[PDB]
Each structure stands twice: as C-alpha cells, then as structure tokens.
Design a protein around this ligand. Structure first.
Ligand SMILES: Nc1ncnc2c1ncn2[C@@H]1O[C@H](COP(=O)(O)OP(=O)(O)O)[C@@H](O)[C@H]1O
Ligand SMILES: Nc1ncnc2c1ncn2[C@@H]1O[C@H](COP(=O)(O)OP(=O)(O)O)[C@@H](O)[C@H]1O
Ligand SMILES: [Ca+2]
Ligand SMILES: [Ca+2]
Lengths: 68, 375, 68, 187, 375
C-alpha cells in the first residue's frame, strides 16, 4: 500500500521532463525549418552572384582587348 | 456579385490544372492532372473504389493509386477518364456550374483535328456550354509580359513549342513541336538511378522524382570542367532525407540528366537542341528582322526555372547567330504562369467575342464550326 | 499489487520517452547552433558576393563608355 | 515449457495438465527487454523468482523461466524454423507495397490478440522496427489494452450491417451453384 | 597442353555457375550458387561446421543448411560470403590457379557502380588476376546463335533484360530491368500451396520447388477456356511422388503461377508484361527499322523452356504491333546456355585484348580504371 504511493511520486517527474523537452524540441524544429529555408535561399543567391561575376569578368576582359 | 455575369478563367497542362474565379490575376485552385484506380482494390467495401483518386485527394495518397496519365503531350491515351476530371474541376474546386459561365481553355499547338470536335462534344452536348474558346498556348503569354515585338518559347511538361510571335501568328510555319519535356525527365531518372542502388519502379513514386527534381537539380555550364571537379566532394553531393527515410546524396546526378535537354542524342532522337531549332525558325523569316528578335527573347514555362538555363542560351546562340548588336533574353523570374497572366488578359477583352463559339453557332455549322471560323 | 504494476509500467514508459526526448532534444539544440552559425557564415559570404558583383556592374559600365 | 521444465525437477507430462501451463503463463510470465543485461541480474534473486503456490500444493519459483520461453517469439531459431521474427516479416510485407505508402503505416500499427497482452510486447517492437525501418517520421503502435476481443467487437459490426447481405450464402444459393458456391462468390 | 597458355571460360547467375576449361564449347562443372551454415550446429565436433555447405556437397544435403542466397538479382546482400564461393570454383572444380589464367565473367546490365570496383578488389589485390573482363550478359549470346540483326531478351532466374541489340549496344536506353524471375516464382508457390494442405516453409526445401517446377509446370494458352476444362480431371492433375513420400497432384497449380509472368499485377507491381516492355523499346528506335526486328526475335534463358512460352508471344505481339510482314521468334530449343556458347566466342577472340584489364592498367588509373575504359 505504501509502495503504491511512492511509485506515483516518480511518475509525475518523468512526465513533466518529457513535456518540457517536447515543448522546446518542437520550437527548435520550427526554428530549424525557418533557418534551413533561408539557408538554401542565400545559397541560391550566392550561386547566382558567383555566376554574375564570372560573366562580368569575361565581358570586361573583352572590353579591355577592344580598348587596346 | 452585382458586377457582371458569367465569367471564369482556366488552363490545363501536363503538370497542374490552373484555374480560378471571374476576373482574377492569379490562379486559385491548381491541382495535378492525374487519375488512377486501385492496384490495392481499395478495401472494396471501405468504399466501391471507383473515383480513380483524382485531385488533392489523389496526390495525397499515391500508394493505392496506379497513376495512369491520360494526356501525354498531344496524344490522349483515353477520353473516357477525362470525363471525371472536369467533373472534379468545375463542381468541386471552382464551385460553379459550367451551364452558366464561359470557359477559356488552352490549345496544344498543332493538335489533331479529330480532337477538337471530340472535346466540343463533351462541353456543348453534355455540359452545355453557350460560350467558350480554346486559345493557342504561347500567344497568350505575349500580351501579359508586355511584349509585342519578341520570340516566344513556351513549354513546361507538355510539348516544346518555338513560336516566333512578334507581329503575326498563323503564317509561315517557323514553328516546331517536340515531345521532350517534364514526363520525359521524370521517366529517365529511374533508369540511371539503377547504378546508385536506387529505383523508383512504378508510376506512383515516379511522380515524386519530379518533386525532388525541382528543388535541387541544376544544369551544368560546361560538362568538361565539371568532370574533374567531381573529385572535390563539395559542390556535388548533398544530403536529402527522403520523407519516409532513405538519404539520397545527389551530386553528379543533378547535372547529368538535364544535359539531355541540350543533347537529345541521349534518348535516340535526331531532334536538334532548343537553340538549333531557334535558328531553323529565324532563318525562314526575312533577313531584316533578326536584329530585333535577338534583342528580346521570351523564355517561359516551369522548365525555365532550373539553375543555369538562361546563361547557357546566351553562350550557344551567339555562336551560330549574328554577332554585332546586343542580345538579351527575357525570362520572367516566374515565367510558368505567364500563360495564365495572359489568360486573364483575353478573359477580360470584349473583342474576344469574335473568337469564341456561341451555343447556336455550333448547330448552324455542324461539328466543323470549330475549324470553319477558328484557325 | 496489480495496480502497482500498472503505475510501475507507466513509470517505465514515462522514463523511456523522457530520456529519449531529452536526448534528441539536446542533440537538436546543439545542431541548431551549428546550422545557425552556418547561416550567419553563408549570409556573410553572400553579402560579399553581392557587393562584389555590384562593383563589377559599375565597372563594366564605365569601361563600356571609355570604349565607345 | 514441459521440455525446459525438466531441468527444474518439474514435468507437466500429459496433455491434460499441459493446458494448465497456459493458465499460469498468462498471469506472470513476461518478456525480456534485453537478455544480455538481464543475464547478470540473475544473481540478484529479487526480480526473478516468485512464490507461486500450485492450487494442489507444489510451489514453483518461476524467475528466469519467465523471460526465457517468450524469447522464442522473436527468435524462432530455438525450435528449428528459419521463419524470421514478427518484425522481419513485417518488412517483407511493407517492401512489396508502393514506396510512397510507408510513412502512414508506421504512424499506426494494429497489434491485436491475446498474445499481445504479456509485459514487454509493444515497447520491444519500437526498438527492433526503427532499426531496419525508415527513420524520419514518428512511429506509434496501436495495441488496444484489451486487443484480444478486437475480432469480436468487429464481429458485432459486420453482424449489424445490411450490406453484409451481399456476402453470406443463402439456402438456395448452395443448390443453384453446387458445393463450389463458396469459392464462386466469396474469395 | 603444348598449345597456348593461360585461358579459361566462366559464367555465373541466379541458378548455376557455368564454367569450364580452356577453349571449350560447353560448360564442364556447373553447380548451384548457394551457401549457408547450420541451423542444426553440425555435431559441432563432427567438424567445426564452417564451410556454409556450398557446391554439390551443399545441394546434396539441404536439411542441415539454412540456404541464404547472396546475390538476389542485382543486390548483393553480403560480399563476405562471396569470398568462399570463388574459393570453391577455381580451386576445387576448375582445378586451376587464378594467378595464371584470365577470367571472363558476366555483367548484370546496369549494375551499381560501387560493385564493379569492389569485385576488382577481390581479384586483382587478393586473387591476383593479370587479365580479366566482365562482358554484358545478353550481347554475348547474339554472336553465338549466328545473329547480327535481332532483338535479345535474355533472362533466367536473375533479372529480365530487354536488349535490342542488332546493330549497336550502349546508345539510347531502349533497355529495361525487372526483378521478376526464378526466385520470384520459387517463393510465390509456397503461398498458394497453403490452400492445398502443402507448405514448403523454410528456404532449404524452397529450392526443391524449382526442381519439380522445371519438369511439369506449364503455361496456359487461354485461362478462360482452361477454367471450364478444370471439371475434366484428365489434363490437370498428375501423380508426382515426392522423393521422400508425399504425392502432389499438381494440375491447376501448373498454369496458375506462370500466369504471373504475363500478369505482374498478381504481385503488386505496375511493371508491364514482357510483351509491352518490348513495344517500349521498339517505339524508341527509328520507324524504318521495325520490319526486320519482328522477322527475328532472340528469346533466350532457362525461363523460355516451359511449355507454351513462344506461341503465346506470337499472339499478344501481333495485336499491338504492325500487321503486314511475317513475324518469327527465334527461341533456340536450348536457349539457356546461349550466353555460354557466346562466352566461348569472345574467349577465343584476340580483339578482346582491347577490352579486358591488365594488371598494370589498374595501378596506372586507380580503381576507376573499370569505368574509365569500359562502359
Ligand atoms: N520554380 C520551379 N522550379 C522547377 N520546376 C518548377 C517550378 N515551378 C514549377 N515547376 C514545374 O513546372 C511544371 C509545370 O510547368 P508548366 O509550364 O505549367 O507545364 P505544362 O504547361 O506542360 O502543364 C511542373 O512539373 C512543376 O513542378
Ligand atoms: N529445360 C529447362 N526447363 C525449365 N527450367 C530450366 C531448364 N533448363 C534450365 N532451367 C532452369 O533455368 C534456370 C537457369 O537459367 P539461367 O538463364 O541460366 O539463369 P540465370 O542467368 O538467372 O543464372 C535454373 O532455375 C534452371 O533450373
Ligand atoms: Ca500544355
Ligand atoms: Ca545473370
């Protein structure tokens, strides 16, 4: 009968720690979803910028030749 | 809505069924043009399966479905299943009766004559349409982007069409049709995927290939220089966790398949690249009419969304093309809905009255009314 | 005695899902910090690429004028 | 049981008393979470042996006997059968269906029957499955706390349905299609 | 033998390991590609079990063995056990050292890239092979039957391959791969056998299913007409005394399972029948190149040995195929060893030198030497 009372004291402790973790875990997952969205977004722009400078330098090289 | 009466806009292809309400600028309820039955016999009792599984309901659960596509670029494998695709369009999503509002459909350039009369039979005789027209794919987008003088190459998953429309349509041929887009790229992957312990076997999961494709796969600027780069495992492989659970490190797989676009020699077709066919259409027109065509090039469609699609064109064109004036390609950052934005245009025009087919007009000129007035 | 087993069993389920959640949550939290750092790093590079290609835009322009 | 019981001066010989083995089984016998860690625990005579007074009169201190036999469930190699465990056969059936139809199957798993009543039956599945199964979405097994009568509760359903008329066999239907009437309409 | 030096022929699949001596026309010592341990713990002392029980010694006693097959069509469940399969091939039956004679293995079309380099590692680095090549399954048989212009469909227990090779290999895809042969028919029986108080449970006796299968089981010409014939107990049931002692009156069981071949819908696969996939490969090639393909069709493999296999093809093909010229299928009465007869060909050719890999060639181009020269 006494053990029936003690066993309950440990149950509530694990339930709260699990809920508290789930609360932050979901928040981190949501945050990650937002960050990863901008990550690939910036990566796409970075790749685009890299493509631009490559074409610019190529054209500039031609302009220099024609200038001379 | 105490404004006018009877109006609507629509557009279908080999990807999505673009449609909306009256007088809209953008679509409202797009959905995949799919339709299948049950290879699983749908708990036969947990409903008399039927409804092939079309619409969001179909796209949601793919497993039970044997996605058998009806209209593969031009050819319609079967019309009987088309019956319950439009029955899902006007009545479920659009929430309007086709026996009231007109309809503006799209026309796959150079579509079989027998098909036009067959379609009209489904609308006028069954769905009772007192007004409708089927405009020609590309020409629509021209008036949207705000161009009157350019060459249009509108294509996504359906069929490639080089339409030099900058001052006249329906004239010399100067147009091409190529069954090499969308589903062609969707079916080719599983083949080459076999060498990497992967194989999207059936058609159901084949549809997913397209989903992942449009989020990472890119085009190589120069296959030669990127061949040695393969050693550098950095710009190639990228961790993509399959929703279920099976990582796929796509790298060289990304720029290998798209190469087929410019090189149709990888699938047994003598069809020249999209930049050669461009010449074929330009060389037909007058000599003193090219300098303005190069100035502006209308590249539209969801196929023109992948990384490295416009810059490559400016490399191959200049080679076998006049080199004196400046050359610029106009590829609307969102050039997929170019047809729909143009659809909204013709949908609000009154001059359009001298194009569509009125209820009585069909009975006064038989079934050939279509090819008797239109063109 | 049986009721004890029911609650005792729940304690095992609670403790299991707690240590499992906290374990992954901690791993996730640590991962977010790494991803966030990568975001800040990539964003910085993209900024350098953007300001660079813009410098070429004004450079290729002035050179085009001198060439003309 | 009677086989392995021989090593503990016990032997339920004939079939009559063999039936009792099942009676006591469903009131104490449990399944080991991990045989390795519970092998060293054997030294600690506390969680193992338990006084069970046989109705007649012959105590049986079952302890290691409880989680030794059930191990055969997951390991059919203890009785000369190449049959793979119930979690392997699960894969065999899933790998046949489409690829885009697994994420929903893992979400809910219907484990029914009186065999799914012993301690340590559902938690073990969530350990072995996740290993040779996709690891991305959440996985939950639905094991009705009383999943034995699941068939009967479902029997009550079909018993009150009228659509069921297009399934059963009417008196005359048998004489009109001979004895093969069963496999001619049903399936 | 005072003739030449260093020569041999080999071939492996999902049935038998075909191999022989130097310059032979037919194999010499074929044996099952099996391998297992002891589910019985082999009298542990009446030898330290080990040797999984491969070769005739294994096939002889099945009971003690838990036959776990390594290479299921394409995928190799484990390479560690492959080590002691080839250790039994060259040394026991062939009676020759692999550190001397070349080796001609077969290649499962479209095999994972990572596998080729792994195999080479086992030969060159361990078994020291200064010369060897791994030819591509089908193409070999073509030169044996004496055909230069035909379409080959070589498959037995491994994987189905539609190889349209009549004037060029490695070109447009026009090829298919289907994991539906041999072991698929061997595992499906026990399922349906349950309804007849029979059940070949474990894998050991499962292998016997194949043995009895290839001596009676036939294919139905038309399931509809043979359904009513079931009443006539004469052409169906046949007394087959199981070696041990348990009669099995196979009748409707004979033509029920093979139906799965033409109808892959009985095992949850959208894969089209072998006569549909044939169209898929033909429609890709040119239009003026079909009339000659129909004239001669190369159907090879042990799967094309059952009664009613060639005549059925001439019924389904003509339907969805051009109907003007004559159509004939060339199915060599013994078309199983077609690959080996072709193996004997390439084994005696000197031009073959510009194909195989020399000892030094591997070290001069790293492990990628395989996919750098071959294709
Ligand atoms: N941003 C994008 N990136 C890649 N593919 C895209 C993008 N947007 C749309 N698509 C794809 O484009 C296709 C639809 O293009 P569309 O030109 O409308 O085709 P169709 O006219 O043949 O119906 C779909 O396969 C879709 O997934
Ligand atoms: N005459 C025959 N009738 C039926 N089956 C046969 C016959 N001859 C061989 N087989 C079977 O064919 C299979 C071997 O065919 P094969 O094409 O060599 O297969 P794989 O290439 O997949 O190893 C074995 O299962 C064998 O029993
Ligand atoms: Ca279209
Ligand atoms: Ca083979």
């Amino acid at each position: 009968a006494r053990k029936l009372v003690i066993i309950e004291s440990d149950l509530e402790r694990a339930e709260e720690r699990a809920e508290l973790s789930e609360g932050k875990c979901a928040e981190l997952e949501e945050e990650l979803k937002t960050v990863t969205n901008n990550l690939k977004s910036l990566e796409a722009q970075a790749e685009k910028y890299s493509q631009k400078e490559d074409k610019y330098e190529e054209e500039i090289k031609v302009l220099s030749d024609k200038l001379k | 809505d105490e404004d006018e009466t009877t109006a609507l806009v629509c557009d279908n292809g080999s990807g999505l069924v673009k449609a909306g309400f009256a007088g809209d600028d953008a679509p409202r309820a797009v959905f995949p043009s799919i339709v299948g039955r049950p290879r699983h016999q749908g708990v036969m009792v947990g409903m008399g399966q039927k409804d092939s599984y079309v619409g969001d309901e179909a796209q949601s659960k793919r497993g039970i479905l044997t996605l058998k596509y009806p209209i593969e670029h031009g050819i319609i494998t079967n019309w009987d299943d088309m019956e319950k695709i439009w029955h899902h369009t006007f009545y479920n999503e659009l929430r309007v009766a086709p026996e009231e509002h007109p309809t503006l459909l799209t026309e796959a350039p150079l579509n079989p004559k027998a098909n036009r009369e067959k379609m009209t039979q489904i609308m006028f005789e069954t769905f009772n349409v007192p007004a409708m027209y089927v405009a020609i794919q590309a020409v629509l987008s021209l008036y949207a982007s705000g161009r009157t003088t350019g060459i249009v190459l509108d294509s996504g998953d359906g069929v490639t069409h080089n339409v030099p429309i900058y001052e006249g349509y329906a004239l010399p041929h100067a147009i091409m049709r190529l069954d090499l887009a969308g589903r062609d790229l969707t079916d080719y992957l599983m083949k080459i995927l076999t060498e990497r312990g992967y194989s999207f076997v059936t058609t159901a999961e084949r549809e997913i290939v397209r989903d992942i494709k449009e989020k990472l796969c890119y085009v190589a600027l120069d296959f030669e220089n990127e061949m040695a780069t393969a050693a550098s495992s950095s710009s190639l492989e990228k961790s993509y966790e399959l929703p279920d659970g099976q990582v796929i490190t796509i790298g060289n797989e990304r720029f290998r398949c798209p190469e087929t676009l410019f090189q149709p020699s990888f699938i047994g077709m003598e069809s020249a690249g999209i930049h050669e066919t461009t010449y074929n259409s330009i060389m037909k027109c007058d000599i003193d009419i090219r300098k303005d065509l190069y100035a502006n090039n209308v590249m539209s469609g969801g196929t023109t969304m992948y990384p490295g699609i416009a810059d490559r064109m400016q490399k191959e064109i200049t080679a076998l093309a006049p080199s004196t004036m400046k050359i610029k390609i106009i590829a609307p950052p969102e050039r997929k809905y170019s047809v729909w934005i143009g659809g909204s245009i013709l949908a609000s025009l009154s001059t359009f009255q001298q194009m569509w087919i009125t209820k009585q007009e069909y009975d006064e000129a038989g079934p050939s009314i279509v090819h008797r007035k239109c063109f």
